[PDB]
């Protein structure tokens, strides 16, 4: 739920993967693992990464 | 440390000692005594400061060509010994892993 072109996302300075606009980066948090677990596992989920 | 006779003498003394070194450890000794700060070719560049200003451009040019001669012979000799070392590590230091 990060808003695009917004200080909630732009001010989150990130190691972006070259070239520019690759939509690939080094994760600023392990939160994308929580997205993968919700897509992979069945409910209920009680997970730690 | 003046005439080209004194420069060619030190270059040949440095060049023949460079061609004599067969191991990398020996070439390190030659680098100290023939290219280091206490070497004859280094003392020739140190004497360029006590020379009159009108003579630094002429004498300094003869020192650079002499230093580049011994420096070029050192680099090619260092590459030759490094090439021999790299080609000999397989057999001369092989073990049963």
């Amino acid at each position: 739920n990060f808003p695009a072109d917004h200080p909630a996302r732009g001010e989150q300075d990130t190691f972006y993967i070259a070239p520019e606009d690759s939509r690939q980066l080094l994760r600023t948090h392990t939160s994308p693992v929580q997205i993968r677990t919700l897509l992979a596992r069945e409910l209920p989920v009680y997970i730690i990464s | 440390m003046l005439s080209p006779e004194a420069l060619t003498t030190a270059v040949d003394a440095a060049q023949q000692a460079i061609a004599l070194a067969d191991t990398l450890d020996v070439l390190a000794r030659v680098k100290t005594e023939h290219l280091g700060d206490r070497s004859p070719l280094a003392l020739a560049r140190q004497a360029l400061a006590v020379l009159p200003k009108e003579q630094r451009a002429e004498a300094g040019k003869r020192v650079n060509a002499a230093r580049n001669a011994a420096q070029r012979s050192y680099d090619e000799r260092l590459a030759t010994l490094r090439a021999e070392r790299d080609a000999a590590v397989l057999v001369a230091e092989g073990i049963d892993v």
Partner: protein
């Protein structure tokens, strides 16, 4: 970017309009702001000063010459018949200026006691103070010059300067742009303290100015995302007028320098209401003002006299002559207010938040206006903020407000800026908070923050106010109820977590490997993914080496380290150099982390809509576009493997120590590995083993190549090992040992083989021929003496035979030994020692 600074006195004043007499300590105010969600980065009190600190007027200036710097002997009127002679080094003041004087006996911030001094051959009876010396501001170049009429000579300096005030430095989260002003912060305090709030932007506080016609011709392209564009002129302002001290001081305490009334009022109103304002010199406008996207390759010079390259996504204000402003970022120097400006046209506009964000970030202009527009500015208060500016500017600079107004509000004009209503159950905040809130708490709190609440049985219909575009879903409303009621009331109950499966086999193996290596003498590090500069050039790898295919970072902290690690050794060797270079020369390190091994160029995937679950094919596509990231275990060794002591001088690191590190990892993983000779940089090609689990390669180990050691500044004889843990299968063996009660037979067999024959191959040949009677085999001698031919070696194994059902004879054991020798002769060409 999220900083907001304001003095407590100003904040208290706005709150006190609807809560007369309201006043709290700075300590309590900080806790209240923290309790409702506003980070207080710093609480900076002003001053303090003590003793005679008074307002003075410079009555004369004598220039003391002949010194290292210009020095002034000043006669200062402090309100009595005896003027004071004060030596001052500053030069930013003239005769007749109002200054702040610290007389002998006064105390300035920091225990600086003031007394008479004998400076520059003169007697100084005090000092003229700077803003920094009074702890009022950061200005230390010159001394503080109060604007004319601010006070009379003799007035108490602390009272005039308001040194009892306190400045609050707040970090505002990007969802609360309305708090980027005294208006929003005062409203928050009215909610937290259950007070009546009088909106400083309401018509009662800013009564509407007359509307008798258009103020300026205007063409607006609605595709630019502009929501409102209002203009009102102020004619006949005095170019000599200065902003009063109360206005210059509040700007100062908020971190804005005063310049001229026209600009000071626009900045003041922006701080007060949150609506950025801008003042144009109307006499420098040529024709119709136009709001449109910039064209390809269009440029403009901004307020600071710097030319900017514009994009077709940038919104501009132009006329018939040039560009007047970069919409929502900064105005241009063309229509900029100057010292001789007499007729001002004020700009009150609402820009698209995303458009301003892209433009200010591309141009690196985080101005006060831009960082407010990108967090959404309340579009309903435009004309209110406009009328506030026009009335205040005309009053200060002796101008006159023109009764004309242009107010573009879209096609068709929008006369109601209410967001869409939200439906939410009355007890939804109660469920998420886990607290049974009192009756009507949700509706009361939502009404406090400005929303319209209507009841429909148990379902609330909530319409958030125009200054709260962050309130879009019921969850947003839940946060408002919970934060105002306080998160401290939420109880602590542990959730019903089901019967979990615990650690996976891979996570359990990762621990066992770490425990084993640490118990064997290795020290774990945390490897960095950024490779050292030119590490593969030092290793002498070929240009087509797969380890060179690395993923590169666009914005690394070091421009010479952009590539991600395809191997763990460069990070381990870097930590190995750090230890050895600092006196710890006998070191053994290991690391267990992932690598980044791309199989193609950097290929991205377009945005998948987040209003739905991605399909299983879309999830697989996102995974395939990512580089392979297997988990590796690696280790490096140098110096002594075993330290010296009362037993002996210790043993240096050798290649066999790295080979044993493989078997330590293999035993921890409960897999069987084989080591085979291989050539693989950066290892020593004659002391390099390739590790196999079955017939699958999992890594290498041994001594590093001496040329790599030289070019990398490593210790001589440094050894290393790197394994691919993902390439090693997780095993779950179930042994069923059968212990035989019968005695064993011990025999030794000596075999002569070629030098190149691996000792393991000889043992495998002996094992294959001996049969099931062979219980254990162990090599204990390798002899290459003179009685052994050149390029040959003698190997002697200790054999242990035992039958499961009988006692053997020496002939029975010798039959298996002779069968083992025949197998060794057939498989590795062994000859029985003789």
């Amino acid at each position: 970017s999220n900083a907001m600074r304001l003095p407590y006195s100003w904040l208290r004043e706005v709150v006190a309009v609807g809560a007369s007499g309201w006043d709290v300590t700075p300590g309590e105010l900080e806790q209240t702001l923290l309790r409702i969600g506003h980070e207080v980065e710093e609480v900076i009190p002003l001053g303090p000063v003590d003793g005679p600190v008074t307002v003075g007027r410079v009555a004369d200036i004598e220039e003391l010459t002949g010194y290292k710097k210009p020095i002034r002997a000043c006669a200062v009127d402090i309100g009595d018949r005896q003027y004071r002679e004060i030596i001052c080094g500053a030069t930013n003041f003239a005769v007749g200026d109002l200054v702040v004087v610290a007389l002998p006996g006064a105390t300035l911030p920091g225990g600086f006691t003031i007394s008479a001094r004998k400076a520059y051959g003169r007697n100084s009876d005090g000092m003229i103070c700077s803003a920094a010396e009074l702890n009022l501001g950061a200005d230390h170049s010159g001394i503080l010059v109060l604007p004319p009429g601010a006070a009379e000579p003799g007035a108490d300096g602390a009272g005039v300067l308001g040194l009892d005030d306190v400045v609050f430095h707040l970090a505002i989260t990007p969802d609360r742009g309305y708090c980027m002003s005294v208006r929003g912060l005062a409203r928050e305090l009215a909610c937290a303290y259950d007070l009546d709030f009088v909106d400083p932007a309401s018509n009662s506080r800013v009564p509407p100015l007359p509307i008798e016609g258009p103020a300026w011709p205007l063409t607006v392209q609605p595709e630019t995302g502009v929501r409102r564009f209002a203009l009102r002129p102020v004619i006949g302002i005095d170019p000599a007028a200065v902003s009063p001290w109360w206005l210059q001081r509040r700007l100062l305490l908020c971190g804005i320098r005063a310049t001229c009334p026209a600009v000071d009022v626009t900045n003041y109103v922006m701080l007060e209401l949150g609506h950025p304002m801008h003042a144009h010199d109307r006499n420098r406008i040529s024709g119709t003002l136009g709001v449109r996207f910039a064209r390809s390759g269009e440029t403009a010079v901004t307020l600071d006299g710097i030319e900017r390259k514009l994009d077709t996504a940038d919104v501009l204000i132009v006329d018939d002559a040039a560009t007047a402003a970069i919409g929502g970022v900064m105005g241009a120097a063309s229509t900029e207010v100057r010292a001789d400006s007499t007729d001002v046209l004020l700009e009150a506009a609402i820009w698209d938040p995303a458009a301003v964000s892209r433009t200010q970030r591309r141009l690196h202009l985080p101005s006060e206006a831009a960082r407010r527009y990108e967090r959404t500015v309340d579009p309903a208060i435009s004309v209110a903020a406009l009328d506030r500016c026009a009335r205040l500017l005309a009053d200060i600079a002796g101008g006159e407000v023109s009764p004309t107004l242009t107010d573009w509000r879209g096609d068709p004009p929008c006369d109601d800026w209410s967001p869409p209503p939200i439906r939410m159950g009355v007890d939804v905040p109660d469920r998420i908070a886990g607290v049974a809130y009192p009756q009507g708490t949700t509706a009361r709190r939502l009404a406090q923050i400005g929303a319209v609440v209507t009841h429909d049985g148990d379902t609330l219909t909530v319409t958030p106010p125009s200054w709260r575009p962050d309130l879009r879903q019921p969850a947003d409303l839940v946060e408002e109820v919970l934060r105002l009621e306080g998160l401290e009331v939420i109880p602590s109950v542990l959730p019903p977590a089901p019967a979990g499966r615990g650690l996976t086999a891979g996570q359990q193996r990762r621990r066992t490997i770490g425990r084993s290596l640490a118990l064997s003498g290795y020290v774990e590090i945390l490897p960095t993914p950024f490779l050292p500069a030119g590490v593969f050039d030092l290793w002498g790898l070929e240009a087509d080496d797969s380890r060179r295919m690395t993923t590169r970072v666009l914005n690394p902290l070091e421009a010479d380290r952009p590539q991600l690690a395809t191997t763990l050794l460069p990070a381990l060797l870097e930590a190995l150099v750090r230890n050895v270079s600092r006196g710890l020369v006998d070191v053994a390190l290991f690391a267990i982390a992932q690598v980044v091994q791309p199989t193609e160029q950097t290929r991205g995937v377009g945005l998948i809509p987040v209003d739905r679950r991605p399909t299983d094919d879309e999830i697989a596509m996102l995974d395939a576009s990512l580089p392979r990231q297997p988990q590796h275990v690696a280790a490096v060794l140098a110096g002594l493997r075993e330290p010296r002591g009362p037993w002996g001088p210790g043993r240096p690191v050798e290649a066999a120590d790295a080979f044993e590190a493989v078997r330590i990892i293999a035993r921890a993983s409960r897999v069987d590995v084989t080591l085979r000779p291989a050539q693989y940089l950066p290892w020593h090609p004659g002391r390099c083993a390739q590790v196999f689990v079955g017939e699958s390669s999992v890594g290498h180990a041994g001594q590093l190549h001496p040329a790599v050691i030289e070019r990398s500044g490593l210790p001589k004889g440094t050894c290393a090992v790197e394994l691919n843990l993902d390439a090693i299968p997780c095993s779950a063996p179930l042994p069923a040992p059968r212990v035989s009660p019968y005695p064993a037979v011990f025999q030794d067999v000596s075999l002569v083989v070629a030098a190149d024959i691996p000792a393991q191959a000889v043992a495998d040949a002996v094992r294959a021929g001996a049969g099931d009677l062979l219980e254990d085999i162990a090599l204990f001698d390798v002899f290459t003496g003179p009685q052994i031919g050149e390029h040959r070696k003698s190997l002697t194994f200790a054999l242990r035979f035992r039958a499961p059902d009988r006692t053997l004879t020496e002939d029975d054991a010798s039959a298996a030994r002779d069968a083992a020798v025949q197998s060794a002769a057939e498989r590795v060409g062994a000859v029985l020692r003789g």
